Design an enzyme around this catalytic site. Structure first.
Site, PDB file in Angstrom:
ATOM      1  CG  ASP A 378      -2.012  -1.172   0.898  1.00 57.50           C
ATOM      2  OD1 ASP A 378      -2.909  -1.065   0.043  1.00 57.50           O
ATOM      3  OD2 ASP A 378      -1.928  -2.233   1.555  1.00 57.50           O
ATOM      4  N   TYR A 461      -9.620  -1.282  -0.405  1.00 57.00           N
ATOM      5  CA  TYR A 461      -9.506  -1.301   1.051  1.00 57.00           C
ATOM      6  C   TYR A 461      -9.200   0.003   1.689  1.00 57.00           C
TER       7      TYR A 461
END
Ligand code: CA
Ligand code: CA
Ligand code: CA
Ligand code: CA
Ligand code: CU
Ligand code: CU
Lengths: 721, 718
Positions: A378, A461
């Site tokens: 991420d 997410y």
């Protein structure tokens, strides 16, 4: 002339409450709590009277305020939450002007290239010693403001350093073999490329999709497989997973399984299409925004601080009770908590020089074509600071929060302001302590925690990170995960279908034809704690049962095995929550002669099953490239250039350039500047309760003062002596 | 008229005056009132109320009629409490029933003169009938009954009384059982020590000049197979002593190595144990603020101006999709019963009864005054009886509702505990969120309903939170605070000669004071009925398996699933890395998965975690309390198996609790199961916890696992 109160206040972002019985308006916005009665010549801001030339006008049930009302009230000065910084803190992030200046300098370079993008433009870390001298002694930093400018020229990385004070380029260095992270335009590029692909359109057609214009792509890094994935290690590639847009605002619920396109970003074309068995696209609408739901009636609940906040925000410096810290934003890791001190009866004691998310990884465990390579880094590969999700006031943070705006540089080098980037809020957290001695007056005090919350969303997410400062000296670090789950299209509708067993071998069947593929969430925090000074040592205290050798009826006793961890290699380990691990200052002791310390707890709990390490065999490449995922505790010598657990350029990396690298030389950790890295994660096995949208799941970490103080830290000021 | 501030504050309400708006804001539990002086009406939870007599401002002081409180606070506009026309069968014994039960046993010729009551509680109808009342409104056609446990001197007698018919149903003397410590025992012990010439003699030797400043503390002695030299049949208590120095904290002045053994029936010391003489730590260490001044703080309030989202009918609490019954027990405190989740209009069983099962705080020091130290808080002292009234706004947030609860005291007289339990809703971050790039954000706030109860036993205060999440999850947190049990030592700093030896069993937290290492082990008894009575225990262990599907991956993430068929296999250690489900094999969700509840005995904590009992398997405490060494236990439902440590744990010679309940290794296949979760901490002290310890917490969770067919909080469809 005037303007309608409600509309204007709303536009402005303030909460507006009208009390018909009291004929009173209650307006709230960050640290400002205002009361105003129609026709009154004065208003109340945080308990203080404010004169108004033009009163709030109530007409035919419509309130109206003058065009200067918002500024006159909300920028009055009676709201003391924010104060102007007189002396610029050395750690202040680059301003918009500085960002633009840094870009102008590199563009003025004879070697600069026209299609060059900027992966990161951040302040170059001033020397740690000078920064502390500034925070503790207020000594000016005499080194020039510099900025690190990491560029992407096509697919090549170039690190440049500019001297903003002297407006000149200090260095320009190409980094061979490193790959750049995924940039915003890469996403549009992949969608376009897929949209112009005749073969892809054909691959898609023979899988049910009629209107190829309705195909939504998502870009993923490919990782490294020493060539088993058949991908040139030299090219800038991205794999593409697709979904069908059915109009329910949730394309994530309609996977086009077993279809992966590999796109070469420089060639701007699909260099490879991996196709597997045709699985009918799950079509049922599964909106998560409530369009198909009944809005439930709920009574109002508000958290109010009518006289203002207990904290003060000067520039980016936060002062709250005994704490003092600097808060800035980085486009890659997000929020950075610096120069954290604890005011111990007049003396500011060092606690942490710099703290922030180190990096994180969300690896999957399904071997199929659309999943074998899935591992999201991420922050490293997508830039979490850049992807910050603005706080939804009163929902993402309590109604008594203060939301800060943060500025960073976008990929084209242009300043970008993220609104409501970080939430700051005090919260009641049960009794700080209590003692009800039988027959005596009770003793109870409330516990207050100052929370610093930041949310970042990467694809499907959403991650929430809270930096919790307890008044008693403890520091908590929590991470919440929510958003839409990555699902696999399957033929089974229920566990009673023929393919059920195989369809669920790597995940739970959470909906008809939909499986939530098992994966883990592994977060790593890099905490440069300076326990009451720079020179520290790592100490282990393992509670053990020892045979009783003192006589009496007992056969055993509870004692502790205390020992120092002298090097990085030994400090890199699994964390047994049954043991105690301390970062101590062997040069300073509390009143009882015990070394001042901080207990490190990488695992303080969580709501999803806990990840005991990486759920990968030791021969897997992701396992090899990323060693930070297998140990919960790491301790390395301080180095300004070692900040990511996964390494600086993790995209298509062939070997650990992170914590594996940082601890490779197994240096000494005896009485020296240490940096703690806590790895904590979850192992996510899905369930229907998490679809179509997942309830926030949390993990907790803690840093507690251990003999750092001489008594209960919140007893209050001593009335005598 | 009557002065408002004075009358209202006596009432327990909070009075706020806003001079700018000339408005009074009055708050008490679920009532949120607004009233302006001279106004003919007031507002109660957002609704208009006509006043008989307007509030009158005299000499800058407000005045209200003598009927104000009743007219406003009991107007009916505050809908928090509702009348209970048909009492739930689990309603605790009322004050009248307690007095009645006492009269029934007193009318028997077997009742002896100074008999005391260890416990007087409701003997509940069968489980099947209670569930039918809750789910079908079917009347339990059984008369109100009560269990009356008496202590005649040192003899336990268990009687059963029929309250409706006012008759004694049974009287059973319980052979060999020792009774729990009763309030009067505290006084006898102190009195007995006060009148002891010998004790006074031993005390003088230790430096105490005024034996009248000596504070006793009664402790159960345990069982050491005679190795402690104590008679198994005498009712005994060991006494640990402290010196009262006037700082309100005798706990900070231990009189180390001095232990007396008192025989409660003979009313005399039957043994004095003396060890090395250690000077009593004398430095004042008050924890009550007498010597401090707190920093001023800006006000913070949590308000619900229109009332609460929950309704309380009798003891039945309704909130969002949850419904449950809350009652009080003198031994274990709060009991959460007939818990159901309203799934789109249909009430589904979740839990029949849940409550603290039992708990223990065992020490790790071998010395004279510590080797036998092990507190069985609820079991030996009665935590419900010792409930600590919630300090409004501090022990619980300002938007809580405080409930009063009634239990019988040791003499059989009803005692109402004020603010015994706190009920409050709280914001708990976003329930869920998804910010899709370039699209309108989606976020909803999470709300949790907490049921908080605090019990204090001697020096330690325990806080328990039963947390109902809107989404179906149930959390159970346990907090610990209070004053640490310390040992007197000669070392002042770690640089002193005896430092090393003084700290072998605990940290030196103050000069001459060592916080002895010990553990905090809580055990929760959860009679979960997952969507029905018949359930099974299923394990799901996430494992790494070799990839056999082809492609570059050498391994995969898979799950090893398997049923745990019997009580012996169910008694196990809990790996937080695994999944343990209580499933209903007869019902499945929309995807064909068995509706279940995931059990998590260890969801976190702020103090080091106990992996088990820090005792060698041959220690007697270890043998007596098997519950401390396993985090999960599942047994067949049995109405008489309610305590993990056994019904009569005082000086027990063997495990009559969970060790006994799982003894026969019965089958847990498709049957009524009862889950027991053991969670504990290993406490190694620090200076930051003295003189008073900052609250430390432990977390547990029960999450719906395929119990539902989708996110439970999305809402009903239009
Ligand atoms: Ca190193
Ligand atoms: Ca350091
Ligand atoms: Ca059951
Ligand atoms: Ca059994
Ligand atoms: Cu997940
Ligand atoms: Cu403790």
């Amino acid at each position: 002339h005037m303007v309608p109160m409600d509309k204007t206040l709303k536009e402005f972002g303030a909460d507006v409450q009208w009390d018909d019985y009291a004929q009173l308006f209650t307006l709230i916005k960050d640290g400002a709590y205002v009361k105003v009665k129609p026709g009154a010549q004065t208003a109340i801001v945080n308990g203080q009277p404010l004169a108004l030339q033009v009163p709030v006008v109530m007409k035919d049930n419509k309130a109206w305020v003058s065009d200067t009302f918002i500024n006159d009230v909300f920028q009055s000065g009676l709201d003391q939450t924010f104060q102007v910084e007189k002396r610029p803190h050395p750690l202040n992030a680059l301003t918009a002007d500085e960002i633009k200046q840094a870009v102008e300098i590199v563009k003025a370079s004879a070697d600069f290239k026209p299609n060059t993008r900027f992966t990161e433009i951040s302040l170059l870390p001033p020397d740690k010693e000078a920064v502390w001298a500034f925070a503790l002694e207020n000594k000016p930093v005499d080194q020039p403001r510099k900025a690190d400018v990491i560029m992407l020229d096509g697919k090549h990385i170039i690190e440049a350093v500019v001297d903003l004070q002297n407006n000149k380029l200090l260095s320009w260095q190409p980094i061979k073999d490193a790959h750049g992270m995924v940039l915003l335009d890469d996403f549009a590029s992949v969608q376009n490329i897929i949209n112009n692909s005749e073969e892809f359109a054909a691959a898609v057609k023979k899988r049910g999709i009629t209107d190829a214009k309705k195909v939504i792509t998502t870009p993923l890094t490919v990782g490294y497989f020493d060539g088993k994935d058949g991908l040139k290690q030299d090219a800038r590639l991205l794999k593409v997973i697709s979904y069908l847009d059915v109009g329910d605002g949730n394309y994530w619920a309609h996977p086009i399984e077993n279809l992966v396109a590999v796109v070469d970003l420089e060639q701007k074309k699909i260099v490879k299409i991996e196709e597997g068995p045709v699985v009918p696209v799950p079509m049922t609408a599964r909106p998560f925004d409530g369009r198909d739901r009944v809005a439930p009636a709920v009574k109002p609940m508000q958290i109010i601080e009518p006289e203002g906040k207990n904290y003060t925000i000067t520039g980016d410096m936060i002062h709250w009770r005994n704490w003092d810290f600097h808060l800035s934003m980085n486009s890659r890791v997000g929020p950075m908590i610096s120069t954290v001190t604890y005011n111990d009866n007049g003396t500011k004691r060092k606690v942490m020089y710099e703290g922030s998310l180190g990096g994180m990884i969300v690896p999957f465990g399904d071997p199929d074509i659309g999943w074998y390579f899935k591992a999201y880094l991420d922050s490293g590969d997508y830039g979490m600071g850049t992807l910050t999700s603005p706080i939804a006031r009163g929902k993402d943070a309590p109604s008594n929060a203060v939301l800060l705006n943060e500025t960073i540089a976008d990929y084209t080098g242009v300043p970008m302001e993220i609104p409501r980037a970080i939430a700051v809020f005090e919260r009641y957290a049960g009794p700080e302590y209590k003692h009800q001695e039988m027959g005596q007056p009770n003793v109870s005090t409330e516990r207050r925690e100052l929370v610093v919350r930041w949310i970042s969303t990467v694809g499907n997410y959403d991650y929430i990170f809270d930096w919790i400062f307890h008044e008693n000296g403890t520091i908590g670090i929590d991470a919440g995960a929510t958003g839409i789950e990555a699902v696999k299209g399957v033929k089974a509708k229920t566990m009673h279908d023929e393919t059920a067993k195989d369809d669920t071998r790597y995940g739970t069947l959470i909906d008809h034809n939909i499986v939530g593929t098992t994966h883990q969430h592994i977060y790593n925090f890099r905490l440069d704690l300076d326990v009451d000074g720079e020179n520290n040592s790592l100490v282990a205290m393992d509670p053990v049962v020892k045979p009783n050798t003192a006589g009496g009826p007992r056969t055993s006793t509870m004692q502790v095995n205390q020992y120092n961890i002298g090097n990085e290699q030994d400090a890199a380990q699994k964390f047994d929550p049954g043991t105690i691990r301390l970062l101590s200052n062997p040069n300073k002791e509390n009143r009882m002669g015990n070394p001042v310390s901080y207990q490190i707890i990488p695992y303080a709990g969580g709501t999803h099953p806990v990840a005991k390490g990486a759920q990968f065999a030791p021969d897997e490449w992701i396992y090899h490239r990323l060693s930070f995922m297998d140990k919960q505790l790491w301790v390395t010598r301080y180095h300004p250039g070692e900040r990511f657990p996964e390494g600086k350029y993790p995209n298509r990396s062939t070997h650990d350039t992170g914590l594996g690298q940082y601890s490779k030389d197994n240096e000494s950790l005896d009485n020296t500047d240490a940096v703690v890295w806590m790895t904590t994660g979850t192992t996510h096995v899905a369930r229907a309760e998490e679809w179509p949208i997942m309830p926030t799941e949390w993990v907790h970490t803690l840093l507690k003062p251990w003999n750092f103080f001489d008594e209960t830290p919140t007893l209050g000021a001593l009335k005598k002596d």
